Design a protein around this motif. Structure first.
Motif, PDB file in Angstrom:
ATOM      1  N   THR J  33       0.454  -1.295  -0.308  1.00 30.03           N
ATOM      2  CA  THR J  33      -0.536  -0.024   0.059  1.00 30.03           C
ATOM      3  C   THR J  33       0.821   1.581  -0.268  1.00 30.03           C
ATOM      4  O   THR J  33       0.540   2.564  -0.505  1.00 30.03           O
ATOM      5  CB  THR J  33      -1.010   0.170   1.570  1.00 30.03           C
ATOM      6  OG1 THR J  33      -1.822  -1.455   1.119  1.00 30.03           O
ATOM      7  CG2 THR J  33      -1.738   1.021   1.298  1.00 30.03           C
ATOM      8  N   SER J  34       2.187   1.255   0.823  1.00 30.82           N
ATOM      9  CA  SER J  34       2.817   2.227   0.437  1.00 30.82           C
ATOM     10  C   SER J  34       3.579   2.150  -0.948  1.00 30.82           C
ATOM     11  O   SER J  34       3.910   4.027  -1.566  1.00 30.82           O
ATOM     12  CB  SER J  34       4.387   2.094   1.466  1.00 30.82           C
ATOM     13  OG  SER J  34       5.211   2.705   1.081  1.00 30.82           O
ATOM     14  N   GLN J  35       3.518   1.691  -1.722  1.00 35.53           N
ATOM     15  CA  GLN J  35       4.459   1.478  -2.961  1.00 35.53           C
ATOM     16  C   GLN J  35       3.429   1.580  -4.052  1.00 35.53           C
ATOM     17  O   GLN J  35       3.449   1.602  -5.548  1.00 35.53           O
ATOM     18  CB  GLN J  35       5.135   0.981  -2.742  1.00 35.53           C
ATOM     19  CG  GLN J  35       6.359   0.864  -4.068  1.00 35.53           C
ATOM     20  CD  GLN J  35       7.375  -0.189  -4.426  1.00 35.53           C
ATOM     21  OE1 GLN J  35       8.202  -0.384  -4.817  1.00 35.53           O
ATOM     22  NE2 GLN J  35       7.595  -0.825  -2.775  1.00 35.53           N
ATOM     23  N   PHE J  36       2.435   0.963  -4.751  1.00 33.76           N
ATOM     24  CA  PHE J  36       1.788   0.265  -5.357  1.00 33.76           C
ATOM     25  C   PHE J  36       0.121   1.444  -6.166  1.00 33.76           C
ATOM     26  O   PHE J  36      -0.444   1.332  -4.737  1.00 33.76           O
ATOM     27  CB  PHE J  36       2.088  -1.411  -5.953  1.00 33.76           C
ATOM     28  CG  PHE J  36       3.391  -1.893  -5.961  1.00 33.76           C
ATOM     29  CD1 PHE J  36       3.881  -1.282  -6.808  1.00 33.76           C
ATOM     30  CD2 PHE J  36       3.472  -2.324  -4.859  1.00 33.76           C
ATOM     31  CE1 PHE J  36       4.901  -2.568  -7.062  1.00 33.76           C
ATOM     32  CE2 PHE J  36       5.906  -2.861  -5.227  1.00 33.76           C
ATOM     33  CZ  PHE J  36       6.056  -2.839  -5.882  1.00 33.76           C
ATOM     34  N   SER J  37       0.398   1.515  -7.136  1.00 33.81           N
ATOM     35  CA  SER J  37      -1.435   1.155  -7.133  1.00 33.81           C
ATOM     36  C   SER J  37      -2.284  -0.081  -6.778  1.00 33.81           C
ATOM     37  O   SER J  37      -2.150  -0.671  -6.772  1.00 33.81           O
ATOM     38  CB  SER J  37      -1.721   1.827  -8.781  1.00 33.81           C
ATOM     39  OG  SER J  37      -2.685   2.066  -9.104  1.00 33.81           O
ATOM     40  N   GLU J  38      -3.523   1.207  -6.538  1.00 29.78           N
ATOM     41  CA  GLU J  38      -4.994   0.166  -6.338  1.00 29.78           C
ATOM     42  C   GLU J  38      -4.934  -1.178  -7.462  1.00 29.78           C
ATOM     43  O   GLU J  38      -4.669  -1.675  -7.214  1.00 29.78           O
ATOM     44  CB  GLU J  38      -6.399   0.519  -5.172  1.00 29.78           C
ATOM     45  CG  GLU J  38      -6.912  -0.028  -4.735  1.00 29.78           C
ATOM     46  CD  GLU J  38      -8.303   0.681  -4.403  1.00 29.78           C
ATOM     47  OE1 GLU J  38      -8.687   0.967  -5.691  1.00 29.78           O
ATOM     48  OE2 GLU J  38      -8.638   0.232  -4.072  1.00 29.78           O
ATOM     49  N   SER J  39      -4.987  -0.110  -8.450  1.00 26.79           N
ATOM     50  CA  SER J  39      -4.816  -0.754  -9.829  1.00 26.79           C
ATOM     51  C   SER J  39      -3.693  -2.341  -9.571  1.00 26.79           C
ATOM     52  O   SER J  39      -4.165  -3.045 -10.015  1.00 26.79           O
ATOM     53  CB  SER J  39      -4.793  -0.421 -10.768  1.00 26.79           C
ATOM     54  OG  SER J  39      -5.999   0.230 -11.158  1.00 26.79           O
ATOM     55  N   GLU J  40      -2.859  -1.539  -9.514  1.00 26.97           N
ATOM     56  CA  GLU J  40      -1.846  -2.535  -9.469  1.00 26.97           C
ATOM     57  C   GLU J  40      -1.730  -4.457  -8.661  1.00 26.97           C
ATOM     58  O   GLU J  40      -2.334  -5.487  -8.381  1.00 26.97           O
ATOM     59  CB  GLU J  40      -0.517  -2.424  -9.373  1.00 26.97           C
ATOM     60  CG  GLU J  40       0.533  -1.901 -10.505  1.00 26.97           C
ATOM     61  CD  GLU J  40       1.696  -0.943 -10.497  1.00 26.97           C
ATOM     62  OE1 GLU J  40       1.536   0.212  -8.978  1.00 26.97           O
ATOM     63  OE2 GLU J  40       2.676  -0.697 -10.514  1.00 26.97           O
TER      64      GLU J  40
END
Ligand SMILES: [K+]
Ligand SMILES: [K+]
Ligand SMILES: [K+]
Ligand SMILES: [K+]
Ligand SMILES: [K+]
Ligand SMILES: [Mg+2]
Ligand SMILES: [Mg+2]
Ligand SMILES: [Mg+2]
Ligand SMILES: [Mg+2]
Ligand SMILES: [Mg+2]
Ligand SMILES: [Mg+2]
Ligand SMILES: [Mg+2]
Lengths: 136, 82, 140, 140, 130, 140, 136, 140, 136, 82
Positions: J33-40
């Motif tokens: 959650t710190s780094q990646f899109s909700e999409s990813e």
């Protein structure tokens, strides 16, 4: 102004003879065979019901502001009359897009002379010999 | 004498046919006043053309907002059961 | 009015009865809350006669086959008349002040041409393509 | 109102009863806290008749197949009426002063074309693409 | 006076042929007035089969967009996404909420104000239940 | 309020009881410390009805599939209502002066377009992408 | 359900239009044009009267336990009616292997809309628009 | 406050007890030395409810995967509430004058947008990237 | 929803049959097999617990603002039910990402009909036959 | 029917492999959650990938503020005793 042949209606050819035709601007929408008069600089509109408003007849249907071909005096034309007419009758714009006789009108001088008589609501043949404007 | 605009000559003008064909292809309804100039309605006698939007291809082509399935641009009158 | 202001030209206006002229004058007087009551009849008649003449000569004809007077010709002539009466009165008041009481209006100039100089002119100006030049011709 | 201001053209307005006109006039008077109570009925009626005429002639028709009057036609005609009444009253007050105090309003020297010149005109302008020119056509 | 018209069909295959029982217009809701004959719907339900695709005279063949179609149609009141709508009796649609009926025939997918065109999915038909 | 201002359209507002309208009016009156207590009910009602109509017509639809009303529709309609009760009151005050006591506000310099002209319209703009044009479409 | 031409009787084709044809197991013997409902897991039986029991119409005759094809909603179909029906009548299963009107039944909602009227015992043409299950 | 202003959404605010709301109101009133004591409770409640609604709708979500509300969500919602209360009182006083003396404040040429238009708004603005548009996405 | 096969968990294929798929925008994060309803212009969100909120089932897992594929009505789907269901039962969105029966819900009409029964927390097979929206 | 994003099909998609491989190489923590899109996270099922930053080369690379010896940019898992 129209002719019936079986199922068909044909428009009549308005101009029988003549070379006195000129281009104007439509001051309003006009239909083929309507009498018209000057209403602005080189602008023509449908003639009203008595004298003082005739330059010629409109040769084709136009919207407002379109270029108008007009047949003037020295032309022979097929035109609808709103009343019964006979040869030698002088005729005048009727105010309804038709012509009527000088005899019926409030005026005393015509713009065309009937060469071929017709009933009310029917095509006569006439020779345009004059124009009329604002005399006061 | 007859001119190309004169009422008895209109059926001989190639352009009167071609513009009535255009008018049928570009309309969405029989309501001419909304869709055409007064000049066009008079010059091409559009009152007498059978204008109703039934000949416009866009009446039949699908144009949905979101297109996941490549459905947009398909024309219903080209399907198997048409 | 019996004949409307858009139905009469400069010569027709002169030919009207006093009553037909007074009906049109009365209609023009509705465009100001003061009616310009301290300006005399002759001046209101002159303003209307001028507005008719100026419509027929400066704001007539076509550009690219479109009529130059695009709006309602009645209200155009009434606003053009009101514009003239307001200039015969001296211009727009930007401010008026009296017995302690004062007001200041947003009637600051939109530009330096004739119709831009009063609220009635700024209205008349919308009826006539804002004095823009959209005319076009072909050769044949 | 029974007939609404967007449902009547200039010819229809003239055909209304006094009560049907008074219902529309009363609705227009709701658009000012003062109700323009010191301006007479004839003037308020003239403003509405003119707003109707001006809607139907200047703010009608389509551009790129989108209607020119994009907002609610009722409120557009009411704001166009209020705009006219405020101009018949002399314009917007930028400042007012007297025995009861002084107030200055943030009119901010807005614009130059008529609708920009009062708050009602500025509101009316948003109903009509802000008087922008987005029209487009093809040839064939 | 005159608004610019619109493509009534958005998407969907469920177009069927009927005879026009009267003159009908693009986007107008219709119901069965005779054997495969369709006429403009009354208000308050019991009279809907689909919407007419294009303008037709009386007695002509007509293409009707039925349920399963997505259409854009004129509404007599404001509508929003997820509103159920049905024929208004006036050539328009109105909401179930406004009408005397308890069930709709199309679901609004894009909202519109009164007299504007909404986008809707047709999902049901209504006839004479008595 | 029982029905919230975002639940009601122009025709819903006309169908509400007086009490359901008065609840919404009371909610709008919370947006000013004065409550606009000197304006009559009809003028507050006309402003709200107009704000509802204007939301539904001018501030509806999508841009790049995003809703054009991005913010909370309740508060948008209330701020648009307050924007219209101001303006009916005359403009937003820049300065007010009474019995010696005087105040001047930082309300000036807001901009030339309608919603820029009072604090309530400036708030309302944030709910609607600040009137920007981020719409986009493909061909297929 | 049959059509006469001279001395001959022909079977009616149950399906007029639609692609919404689905497969089930017959819970009993069924006949072409008979309304059916889910009697078990992917199993269908002849509908009883007064609603709550309709998935589609049986497309061809079957014995018990055979796989049965069924026209669902979105199909236009030819079906027998127990009573006179007219265009725009809503109809539903009668319990008698035929349809009747909603108006005649104890139900308040139909499953097909009559497109072509027919007398008692004749074949109407109808569009199937709904299914009915157990709601309690 | 026991439930904090950052822990409640619009629906939660409506569900709080009057005391829980009054605790949050009391906290907001600490952001002005005057406490806005002459403005009624309903108006302070409306401002907080609106600030919560506006936070959750206009100042929420992510922007290049960074949270759009980068600062403390508590103080952001409080400053957004204070901003609204100050706008309900007519905006920033640029200058005040009376029997007790006169004062002029360094408000200066503040920008066109609502959050720029009061000191609380300008504080809130630093919590939300100063309304900058640093969002980014890529195709996979 | 899941098959177990030894060590392995396999996701079930949601859509059994049906051609009417349509694309929408996610109003929130959604997971495959959830019932959804219209929540903005072409925007879909998870259905709440009773009637008036159903357009179709979401076919694949999405983040907020991503494009969604729906199976609408006319589709047959593998869906998890929160209670024990039987053939012919009408079912409705449950508010929990599952379906439940009309009989258990506060509503009076369903959106899908069970063709293949299931226990609580188990995959049934059902035919989607109706949408539901705001009727007031 | 199965779409490219459908849950039973993700393991067939070349992009699902390529992007999960990218995610492991890019990561600096197990906290997705710190780094990646909700999409990813949804599209690539990144909860199910063993993401922890142990596959990121920059976890192992020296980057001292002053370097007199050209040590920076060396990866410790390329040394003799690794
Ligand atoms: K006579
Ligand atoms: K509604
Ligand atoms: K009604
Ligand atoms: K019975
Ligand atoms: K329940
Ligand atoms: Mg000769
Ligand atoms: Mg014009
Ligand atoms: Mg619009
Ligand atoms: Mg079919
Ligand atoms: Mg279907
Ligand atoms: Mg930070
Ligand atoms: Mg199927």
């Amino acid at each position: 102004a129209t002719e019936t042949q079986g199922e068909h209606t044909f428009p009549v050819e308005v101009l029988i003879s003549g070379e006195e035709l000129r281009g104007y601007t439509a001051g309003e929408a006009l239909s083929a065979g309507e009498p018209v008069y000057l209403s602005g600089d080189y602008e023509v509109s449908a003639s009203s019901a008595d004298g003082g408003e005739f330059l010629g007849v409109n040769l084709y249907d136009v919207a407002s502001g379109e270029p108008v071909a007009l047949a003037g005096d020295d032309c022979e034309v097929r035109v609808e009359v709103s009343e019964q007419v006979t040869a030698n009758d002088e005729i005048l714009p009727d105010g309804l897009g038709t012509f009527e006789t000088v005899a019926t009108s409030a005026a005393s001088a015509g713009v065309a002379i009937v060469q071929e008589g017709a009933a009310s609501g029917e095509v006569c043949e006439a020779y345009i010999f004059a124009v009329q404007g604002t005399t006061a | 004498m007859q001119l190309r605009r004169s009422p008895g000559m209109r059926p001989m003008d190639r352009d009167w046919h071609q513009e009535r064909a255009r008018a049928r292809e570009q309309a969405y309804s029989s309501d001419l006043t909304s869709q055409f100039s007064e000049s066009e309605i008079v010059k091409y006698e559009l009152d007498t053309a059978q204008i109703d939007g039934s000949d416009n291809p866009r009446t039949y082509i699908w144009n949905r907002t979101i297109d996941l399935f490549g459905m947009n641009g398909t024309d219903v009158r080209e399907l198997r059961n048409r | 009015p019996d004949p409307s202001i858009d139905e009469v030209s400069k010569s027709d206006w002169d030919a009207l009865t006093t009553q037909e002229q007074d009906d049109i004058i009365s209609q023009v007087e509705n465009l100001s809350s003061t009616g310009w009551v301290n300006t005399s009849r002759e001046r209101k008649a002159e303003a209307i006669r001028s507005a008719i003449a100026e419509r027929d000569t400066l704001y007539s004809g076509n550009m690219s086959r479109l009529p130059t007077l695009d709006g309602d010709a009645e209200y155009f002539t009434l606003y053009l008349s009101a514009h003239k009466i307001q200039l015969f009165e001296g211009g727009e008041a930007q401010s008026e002040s009296g017995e302690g009481g004062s007001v200041s209006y947003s009637t600051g100039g939109g530009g330096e041409k004739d119709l831009q100089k009063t609220r009635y002119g700024r209205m008349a100006l919308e009826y006539v393509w804002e004095d823009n030049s959209i005319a076009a011709l072909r050769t044949y």
